[PDB]
Amino acid sequence: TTGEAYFEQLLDHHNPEKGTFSQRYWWSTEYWGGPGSPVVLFTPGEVSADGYEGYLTNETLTGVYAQEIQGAVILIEHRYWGDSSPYEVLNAETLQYLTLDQAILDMTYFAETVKLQFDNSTRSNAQNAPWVMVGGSYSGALTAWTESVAPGTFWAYHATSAPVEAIYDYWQYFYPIQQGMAQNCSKDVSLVAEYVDKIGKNGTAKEQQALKELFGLGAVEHFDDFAAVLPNGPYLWQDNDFATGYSSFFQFCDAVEGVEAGAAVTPGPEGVGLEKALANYANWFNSTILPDYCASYGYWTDEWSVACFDSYNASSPIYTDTSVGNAVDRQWEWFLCNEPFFYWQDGAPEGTSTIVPRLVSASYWQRQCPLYFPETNGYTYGSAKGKNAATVNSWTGGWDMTRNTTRLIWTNGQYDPWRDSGVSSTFRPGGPLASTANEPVQIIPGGFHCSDLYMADYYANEGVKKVVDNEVKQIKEWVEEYY
Ligand SMILES: *[C@@H]1O[C@H](CO)[C@@H](O[C@@H]2O[C@H](CO)[C@@H](O[C@@H]3O[C@H](CO[C@H]4O[C@H](CO[C@H]5O[C@H](CO)[C@@H](O)[C@H](O)[C@@H]5O)[C@@H](O)[C@H](O[C@H]5O[C@H](CO)[C@@H](O)[C@H](O[C@H]6O[C@H](CO)[C@@H](O)[C@H](O)[C@@H]6O)[C@@H]5O)[C@@H]4O)[C@@H](O)[C@H](O[C@H]4O[C@H](CO)[C@@H](O)[C@H](O)[C@@H]4O[C@H]4O[C@H](CO)[C@@H](O)[C@H](O)[C@@H]4O[C@H]4O[C@H](CO)[C@@H](O)[C@H](O)[C@@H]4O)[C@@H]3O)[C@H](O)[C@H]2NC(C)=O)[C@H](O)[C@H]1NC(C)=O
Ligand SMILES: *[C@@H]1O[C@H](CO)[C@@H](O[C@@H]2O[C@H](CO)[C@@H](O)[C@H](O)[C@H]2NC(C)=O)[C@H](O)[C@H]1NC(C)=O
Ligand SMILES: *[C@@H]1O[C@H](CO)[C@@H](O[C@@H]2O[C@H](CO)[C@@H](O)[C@H](O)[C@H]2NC(C)=O)[C@H](O)[C@H]1NC(C)=O
Ligand SMILES: *[C@@H]1O[C@H](CO)[C@@H](O[C@@H]2O[C@H](CO)[C@@H](O)[C@H](O)[C@H]2NC(C)=O)[C@H](O)[C@H]1NC(C)=O
């Protein structure tokens, strides 16, 4: 049996008397064992909960967990998304309560205090029953940070592809993509990305314009903004999966190496060279990607519109649409500018090879925060009041929260673009966290973003199956310890 309910969440957990707001949540007792049985808690994170109904199911890791431990599952919508915002206009004033501190106490308070329709008794709240927090991507960092910051409510935690370390200049976002990408495609995307830099730095107004026209982006005023489209190639890697097959990422690397989908003859490890890779890249963007791009924000109808790419128009609707269901996910942008997480997705520093133009820099992204959030009735975003990535790592422990852990399990993906801000990062001091009995961690060979949350991956790849079986076994053994 299933249901949808509303929980009256505290607006300010340190001031419970500024009042409440309504937060949307769903539950299934499909595998529930009755009072005192476990509860598996999940939030989609930085997104409306519309369409996430599958996480109540054993087609996702969350239900698989519930089936094996005979618990219920509850999907909770994160504050400020979907039907769970305390305000209908999101600016620097109203967004003041969208904070990691508040999100964390949101879950512990919910688990400790919600009056569940399938159990009016207190006997399945977190004080009298084991609650398992599961999350991937930011929700995984939320799971882990709750273990770090408010340890005593949930019984166990599983965090997959969690970016627990806040990083300002996060060029390492593209490092795993470089590694897992084909060699020829890696070298050739490096060539094009470094050419865009040389034209933007040491190049003429005429050279710059010509280059921007190869992509069909001649009307883009700022060269900055043109360089920011090129990761559209590497970005597709995050849409990968062990069941996506011949996916859009691989279609892009074929376009760059000048071949058709099932070609008999292909380039070797060294690729096709700059003059050829430049044209294929440029033609791939103008042909497949650019059409209807801006139109997918709903703010423009023109199929060949080029306005979405203008990050300097302070009046663009990507900045001024303050509605809860805006298109750019400004709520997530607030965490980046205010917490501050940053995670700015940039080209590598000068010593280091890059598949993204170095023009796409931390400053490029930082600049956009006051346009997303102009100063409102005295309030700003935190990185303008002096906060930085150490503001968060000081509090959460970042990478080093692994030092004292209890009943928390990590999964990461070998080629996950969010790997290098998580616990298995190659840049973390000492290298990837070593697995221990007390604190297990495993890396999915060849893995992408949260590639163990969909069961389609379980059947499609024998590596995921090993990882899914071990962690399901660890969550079972740990919950049994509650009795
Ligand atoms: C130099 O540059 C080259 C050009 O870019 C580059 O080649 C490209 O490499 C990438 C990465 O290796 C290839 O992507 C893979 O493609 C696999 C499918 O290949 C078949 O389809 C391709 C697409 O073409 C389509 O074309 C038409 C379209 O209508 C149709 O034919 C159909 O749609 C085709 O699919 C073909 O390109 C490909 O061609 C092979 O066979 C041809 C003869 O028929 C031959 O001409 C081809 O030549 C190439 O290779 C040979 C060497 O063998 C070389 O001599 C040639 O010159 C040329 O290089 C080629 O042999 C096929 O017909 C995908 O399976 C694969 O995706 C898997 O992996 C990723 C990443 O992990 C996952 O996202 C996917 O989900 C998927 O995972 C599944 O499969 C893997 C298997 O490894 C498992 O690990 C997973 O667990 C999962 O398994 C599950 O699903 C499977 C079914 O999907 C089940 O089997 C399994 O049991 C599980 O259930 C990836 O997309 C890309 O195709 C290729 N491009 C070309 C043109 O070749 C070079 O790498 C590069 N070299 C260097 C050194 O840098
Ligand atoms: C996932 O859960 C479904 C139920 O939601 C399981 O299907 C049930 O299986 C039992 C035993 O085989 C049957 O008695 C039920 O009639 C099935 N229910 C439905 C709705 O089909 C399914 O077996 C589970 N999958 C796995 C891999 O364990
Ligand atoms: C690891 O962290 C846990 C959680 O913060 C610590 O457990 C606390 O220990 C103090 C002192 O004994 C108690 O007053 C608290 O009630 C405990 N809280 C919980 C939630 O268990 C634990 O001491 C830490 N372990 C190490 C080795 O530092
Ligand atoms: C910045 O964005 C605003 C809003 O999208 C643009 O203003 C619109 O311009 C179109 C034609 O370009 C008019 O049809 C609309 O009526 C305008 N609406 C508003 C609210 O201004 C503005 O042109 C953009 N600025 C630049 C330099 O491109």
Burial class (CB in 10 A: 0-12, 13-18, 19+), 204: exposed
Rounded CA-CA distance 59/455 in Å is 5
Query: Residue 454 pairs with which residues in a beta bridge?
Result: 60
**Helices 274-284 + 248-256 axis angle, to 10:** 140
In contact, 23 and 81? CB cutoff 8 Å? no
CA distances (Å), 88 to each of 85, 91, 320, 413, in order?
Answer: 7, 10, 14, 37
- The ligand whose atoms approach the alpha carbon of 311 most closely is 4
Span 2-164+398-480: which CATH code? 3.40.50.1820
Q: Does ligand 1 have an atom closer than 6 angstroms to the CB of 259? A: yes
Q: Which of 49, 27, 50 lies closest to 40 in space, CA to CA?
A: 27
CB atoms within 10 A of CB 379: 14
DSSP secondary structure of 21-72: EEEEEEEE-TT--STT--EEEE---SS--TT-GGGGSTTBHHHHHHHHHT-E
CA distances (Å), 86 to each of 97, 107, 210, 262, in order?
Answer: 9, 16, 48, 52
Exposure letters 76-91 (e unless 16+ CB within 10 A, then b): bbbbbbbbbbbbeebb
Q: Which of 362, 50, 49, 30 lies closest to 40 in space, CA to CA?
A: 30
Rounded CA-CA distance 375/359 in Å is 27
In contact, 259 and 266? CB cutoff 8 Å? yes
Number of C-alpha atoms within 13 angstroms, CB side, residue 220? 27
Enumerate residues 6+ apart whose C-beta is below 8 A from 116. Answer: 5, 27, 124, 125
Q: Which of 399, 400, 368, 361 lies closest to 383 in space, CA to CA?
A: 368
Q: Residue 4 is encoded by which pair of tokens?
A: 């949808």
Nearest protein CA to atom 25 of ligand 4, as residue: 313
Nearest protein CA to atom 28 of ligand 3, as residue: 404
Query: Residue 431 pairs with which residues in a beta bridge?
Result: none
Active site residues: 137, 416
Give every strand in the sheet of 131-136, ordered side by side: 2-10, 20-28, 72-76, 39-42, 131-136, 156-160, 408-413, 441-444
CA 90 to centroid of ligand 2, rounded, Å = 43
In the block, tokens 């306005």 appear at: 307
Nearest protein CA to atom 3 of ligand 2, as residue: 58
In contact, 329 and 46? CB cutoff 8 Å? yes
CA 327 to centroid of ligand 4, rounded, Å = 18
Q: Which of 314, 324, 298 lies closest to 373 in space, CA to CA?
A: 314
Rounded CA-CA distance 252/261 in Å is 10
Number of C-alpha atoms within 13 angstroms, CB side, residue 185? 22
Enumerate residues 6+ apart whose C-beta is below 8 A from 143. Answer: 133, 134, 135, 157, 158, 159, 162
Atom of ligand 3 nearest to the CA of 151: 20
In contact, 118 and 137? CB cutoff 8 Å? no
CA 365 to centroid of ligand 4, rounded, Å = 22
Q: Does ligand 1 have an atom closer than 6 angstroms to the CB of 257? A: yes
359 phi-psi bin (left φ>0, alpha ψ -120 to 50, beta other): alpha
How far is Cα of residue 446 from the mean position of the Cα atoms in its chain?
Answer: 18
CA 177 to centroid of ligand 1, rounded, Å = 17
Rounded CA-CA distance 329/311 in Å is 15
The DSSP element (H or E) to which 101 belongs, if any, is helix 100-113
The DSSP element (H or E) to which 342 belongs, if any, is strand 342-344
Number of C-alpha atoms within 13 angstroms, CB side, residue 112? 14
Rounded CA-CA distance 136/40 in Å is 14
Atom of ligand 1 nearest to the CA of 186: 116
DSSP secondary structure of 397-429: -GGGGGGS-SSEEEEEETT-TTGGGSTT-SSST
Give the SS3 label for residue 374.
coil
Number of C-alpha atoms within 13 angstroms, CB side, residue 453? 26
CB atoms within 10 A of CB 15: 10
Amino acid at 481: E
DSSP secondary structure of 317-331: HHHH--STT-SS-HH
CA 222 to centroid of ligand 4, rounded, Å = 17
Residues of the chain with CATH 3.40.50.1820: 2-164+398-480
- The ligand whose atoms approach the alpha carbon of 402 most closely is 3
- The ligand whose atoms approach the alpha carbon of 182 most closely is 1
Q: Which of 162, 103, 170, 92 lies closest to 333 in space, CA to CA?
A: 92
Q: Where are the alpha helices (DSSP H) in 155-288?
A: 175-180, 183-202, 205-214, 223-227, 232-235, 248-256, 274-284
Q: Does ligand 1 have an atom closer than 6 angstroms to the CB of 442? A: no
In the block, tokens 């090993």 appear at: 466
Nearest protein CA to atom 5 of ligand 3, as residue: 151
Q: What is the resolution of this structure in A?
A: 2.7
Q: Name the structure determination technique.
A: X-ray
- The ligand whose atoms approach the alpha carbon of 280 most closely is 1
Q: Which of 112, 121, 117 lies closest to 155 in space, CA to CA?
A: 112
Q: Which residues surround ligand 3 with Cβ inside 6 Å?
A: 151-152, 404
Q: Does ligand 4 have an atom closer than 6 angstroms to the CB of 313? A: yes
CA 99 to centroid of ligand 3, rounded, Å = 25
- Rounded to whole angstroms, the maximal C-alpha distance in the chain is 74
Atom of ligand 2 nearest to the CA of 57: 5
Nearest protein CA to atom 2 of ligand 2, as residue: 58
Atom of ligand 4 nearest to the CA of 313: 1
Task: Respond yes or no on whether the N-terminal peptide bond of residue 445 is cis (omega within 30° of 0).
Answer: no
The DSSP element (H or E) to which 343 belongs, if any, is strand 342-344
Q: Which of 179, 66, 165 lies closest to 124 in space, CA to CA?
A: 66
Give the SS3 label for residue 273.
coil
Rounded CA-CA distance 73/33 in Å is 12
Q: Does ligand 2 have an atom closer than 6 angstroms to the CB of 58? A: yes
Give the alpha-carbon dihedral of 416, 418, 420, 425, to 10 degrees: -60
Number of C-alpha atoms within 13 angstroms, CB side, residue 98? 29
